[PDB]
Amino acid sequence: STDDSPYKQAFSLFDRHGTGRIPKTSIGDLLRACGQNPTLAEITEIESTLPAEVDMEQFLQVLNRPNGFDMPGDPEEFVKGFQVFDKDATGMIGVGELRYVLTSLGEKLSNEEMDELLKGVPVKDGMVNYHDFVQMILAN
């Protein structure tokens, strides 16, 4: 926790001054490593609230919005949760595992929402190869 290679160590890598602080330019590509890459307007907007120089504290403050890890919404967090019961997954996702992680996160799609999903799909464990869900979700 107090030695994040992709967050703490990586942060130091993008330190042009070497004083544990980084400007909007650095935060841009920095965020890319832990998600995506925004625009200068976005990073500058962040500086408008957090101290001019976005040091380990400033950056971590905005990142850890819900106070702490495993909650803000990290790409590796969601991947690890779904990967629990998805070693290979050759035509099946298994809602049971997806709900176990999401529901335990912050009362996401609990048994209720999943119950309706299982009723629609002619399966006995919400198995659809994680295609029909993402397909309809990205097709609007």
UniProtKB/Swiss-Prot annotation:
For this protein, the record's InterPro entries field holds: CALM/Myosin/TropC-like (IPR050230), EF-hand-dom_pair (IPR011992), EF_Hand_1_Ca_BS (IPR018247), EF_hand_dom (IPR002048)
- What GO CC annotations are associated with the protein? cell division site; cytoplasm; cytosol; medial cortical node; mitotic actomyosin contractile ring; myosin II complex; nucleus
Q: Name one GO molecular function term.
A: metal ion binding
In its record, the post-translational modification comment is: Phosphorylated on either Ser-1 or Ser-5 but not both. Phosphorylation is not essential for the function of the protein.
Q: Which UniProt keywords apply?
A: Calcium, Cell cycle, Cell division, Cytoplasm, Metal-binding, Motor protein, Myosin, Phosphoprotein, Repeat, Septation
Q: What is its main location?
A: cytoplasm
Where, by residue number, does Ca(2+) bind? D86, D88, T90, M92, E97
Domain named EF-hand is located at 2-37, 73-108, 108-140
Tell whether Magnesium is among the UniProt keywords. no
Q: This protein's superkingdom?
A: Eukaryota
Which PROSITE patterns does this one have?
EF_HAND_1, EF_HAND_2
- Location relative to the cell: Cytoplasm
GO process annotations (BP): division septum assembly; mitotic actomyosin contractile ring assembly
> What other remark does the UniProt record contain for this protein?
In vitro, this chain does not seem to bind calcium.
Q: What does this protein do?
A: Involved in cytokinesis. Required for the formation and function of the contractile ring.
- Subunit details for this protein? Binds to myosin II chains myo2 and myo3. Interacts with vps27 and a PI 4-kinase pik1.
Q: What is this protein called?
A: Myosin regulatory light chain cdc4
Q: What is the lineage of its organism?
A: Eukaryota, Fungi, Dikarya, Ascomycota, Taphrinomycotina
Name of the gene: cdc4
